[PDB]
């Protein structure tokens, strides 16, 4: 069960497109230090990921796992998890639905629905 | 010398059209077609069409 060669064993990014069959185009960003300014800026990379169930929507944050064997020229990752669904975020700290900086369901309540 | 400028303008636009036509022929010939796509006629875009 040897792991991939690619350095990016785990990459987080935003689903910027979903028009290919069973594939999601994901834009990841990393911080790179400008040598002259000594300030960090965003260098963004595009990753094709295998979305087996076509469960991804544009704008949602996702976690990708490096595939052991490249599926195709560009598809070298799979969809591990959908960290945040677009507009359907669930607060990790409390576990309650939220819509921005607000709770759709109060954490004091226990709906269990 | 405006007369020459109009003459230069009409001859410059004619070369501009031939370059456009030739660039379109390169594409289909490279793709492997021996004739341009059926029902295709390169549009004349630099002539006095308006």
């Amino acid at each position: 069960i040897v792991r991939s060669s690619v350095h990016a064993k785990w990459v987080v990014g935003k689903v910027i497109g979903t028009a290919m069959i069973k594939t999601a185009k994901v834009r990841a960003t990393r911080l790179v230090l400008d040598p002259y300014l000594l300030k960090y800026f965003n260098k963004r990379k595009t990753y094709f990921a295998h979305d087996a169930l076509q469960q991804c929507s544009v704008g949602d944050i996702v976690l990708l796992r490096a595939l052991p064997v490249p599926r195709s020229k560009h598809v070298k990752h799979e969809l591990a998890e959908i960290i945040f669904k677009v507009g359907r975020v669930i607060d990790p700290v409390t576990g309650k639905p939220c819509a921005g900086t607000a709770y759709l369901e109060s954490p004091l309540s226990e709906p269990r629905e | 010398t405006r007369f020459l400028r109009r003459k230069v303008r009409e001859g410059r636009l004619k070369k501009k059209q031939i370059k456009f036509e030739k660039d379109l022929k390169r594409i289909w010939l490279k793709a492997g077609l021996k004739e341009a796509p059926e029902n295709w006629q390169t549009p004349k875009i630099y002539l006095k069409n308006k």
């Binding site: 910027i16 497109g17 544009v58 704008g59 669904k85 677009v86 507009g87 359907r88 819509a99 921005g100 759709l104 | 456009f20 660039d23 379109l24 594409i27 289909w28 793709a31 492997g32 077609l33 341009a36 796509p37 059926e38 295709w40 390169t42 549009p43 875009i45």
Partner: protein
Amino acid sequence: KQDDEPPSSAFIKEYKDIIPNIEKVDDVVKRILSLEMASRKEKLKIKQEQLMNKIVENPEDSRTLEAQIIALTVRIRNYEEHMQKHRKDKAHKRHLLMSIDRRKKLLKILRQTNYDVFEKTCKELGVEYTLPPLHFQKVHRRFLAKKALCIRVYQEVQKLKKQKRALKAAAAAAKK
């Protein structure tokens, strides 16, 4: 058009809930306070209220994104009727295009925060939302003509490949 247009017999929004309580009111008084003797602005306050009830969970609140989007759909449809008679009004043509752009911006923020509300709002208001294209495409006669040929050339090449595959498979099948 839209499914609902307020009737002429409807009362204005100020007295919509007051006249019903009053025991008996004359036909003339009802006609003075109806939408027949009111400005177009009054008829639009009734259209908006109907949409807020039919879409928003809490029609009392008008500061939600869904409510603001409903406020802009009434204005947008109003400007469109205005511009159908005043074909050369350039100030309201700017008002129409700026409200459309404002609604698209709000629908984007709504989609990113409450997707469930977003889906109902678009379905009820009949508004189609198209996502912003990642890359801007330039447009001019030379580009549109070259881009059309490239699509045509590709399609022909793929059609030839499909025909070759069918002929190749057919020959193999006969041999078998």
